[PDB]
Symmetry: C3
Subunit: 212 residues, 3 copies
Amino acid sequence: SYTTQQIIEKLRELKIVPVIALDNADDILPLADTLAKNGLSVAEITFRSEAAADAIRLLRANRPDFLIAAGTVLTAEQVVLAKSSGADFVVTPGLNPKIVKLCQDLNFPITPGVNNPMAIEIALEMGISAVKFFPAEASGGVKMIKALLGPYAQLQIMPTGGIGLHNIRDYLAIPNIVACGGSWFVEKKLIQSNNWDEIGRLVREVIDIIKE
Amino acid sequence: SYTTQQIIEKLRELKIVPVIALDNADDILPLADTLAKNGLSVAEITFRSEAAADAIRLLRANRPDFLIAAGTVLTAEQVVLAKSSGADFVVTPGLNPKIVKLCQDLNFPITPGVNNPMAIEIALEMGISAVKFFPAEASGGVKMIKALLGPYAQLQIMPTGGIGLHNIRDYLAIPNIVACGGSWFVEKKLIQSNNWDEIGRLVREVIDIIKE
Amino acid sequence: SYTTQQIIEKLRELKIVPVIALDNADDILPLADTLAKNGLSVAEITFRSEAAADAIRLLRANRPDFLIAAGTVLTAEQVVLAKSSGADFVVTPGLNPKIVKLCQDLNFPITPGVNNPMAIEIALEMGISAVKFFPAEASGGVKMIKALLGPYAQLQIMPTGGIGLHNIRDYLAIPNIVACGGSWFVEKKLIQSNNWDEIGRLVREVIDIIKE
């Protein structure tokens, strides 16, 4: 049971987080074996798919050490089920204060999404310094981030949205940016076709470009 | 009186809503005749004009089945006056929780405006799933809307701001987009000169473009 | 002591506000000197720098008629210290309702930052009509401002963020724009190397481009 800051530091070593949507929860086992084999033992499983909770539970049992996030959490029921399924922390696209307060009252780490100054100031008012920046590219990309970093100099940021091979290095060049999220290397059609080699290829490719 | 969901379904058949600002309230009659004749029996009368409430009243008396929205509603006094004037629903540029609650406590349909994830979360927390997206082009346009529809896949959106003949079809191609608001076919200068023929043509032009 | 409205009219005459980040408090005297000789008796001292309070106090004593703003104020302690040090008003990058209400409760003028309709409507609900627009360029610049001035036509705006010589005239051509904030003419390097002449040249350069 990692604290929020230990999770943040573990993400800082990883730098890229796969955002996984599944139609079939059993696909999480060969998928996670492929991610771990290629050096990424972390996954944000989206509640946009109904199979999310069962996948978190199966993965926790098979790989007790895997870093697991429940993503796109919008309701109190999802928080509760994310915690009992075994997730390590929660990720949300926006900041709904009842949802943030609930994770805090359950000692359940949460990285909420912000994209402007009002949202950042609500987060800082609730004791939160590590946030998701979403949607990254449509909200102004690297230019908006650098601008928000003038007055909010100690924010720890985790961007998601419109991030690919062509711009991941631009985001990772910024010291306050902890890690980026994306799904091009774990695309839904590749998971559905069980093409584990293509997935492992794309994983190695993003890992290489980052360490360039 | 129509419920909120019935109004959303009517707007979905119309697809384009005229946003009207006028100096002389009496012009709403020839203007609505011109809209009705050419296939568009709907109007959003903005409270940016002082002639707004008299125009809504006059129109409700002359054409009892016309769909009428009161736009730019920022105060409780305007909410109350829009209701007694006879408007079917309220439209707002942003989301003030006190104005939304009053409309819901008065059984008066309201489509408030948002442009980022924080504002969408508050709308969903207050039981609202049909929102105005404003200002649409300056907030990032179609690309910002598609990015928002990843996590909030059930929102029903009505874009306003920067919409014209050249981009109305790019917005209407997205399924969750109900209808768009626009003022170029009801330009103030044409209303000031009572140029009802040019208004009729512009309305027919957008209607045909959309059907294409 | 000036009221909030009196400060706004005072900024409407200056048109440009130096945003200063000092490492050494004593540098404020030679800086205030250069600025005051070249036509701008006004500064926004950031609490981003540890010696901000001493700088304001020193500057107030030496030139009691200078217009001083405490900027980047995020906590109640900062509000209380900015007032006892002698600042005329507070500038914030976003809008934290607890901070604004405390300034109003101490009769201390504040211009809070906004960049989207929801933040504007919270301001208006709090009786505020003069706001900082930040970060200006990254939020859509001149195009965002003009789209927001449609429904919020009485707003009084002060943009900051990406404002340079190449675009200050585009913002000042909008009547609701009171004055812009910038730091290129009082840049870090120039202060530390005590380049009072290079700074004085840039101040005249921007005042001239504005009045052209």
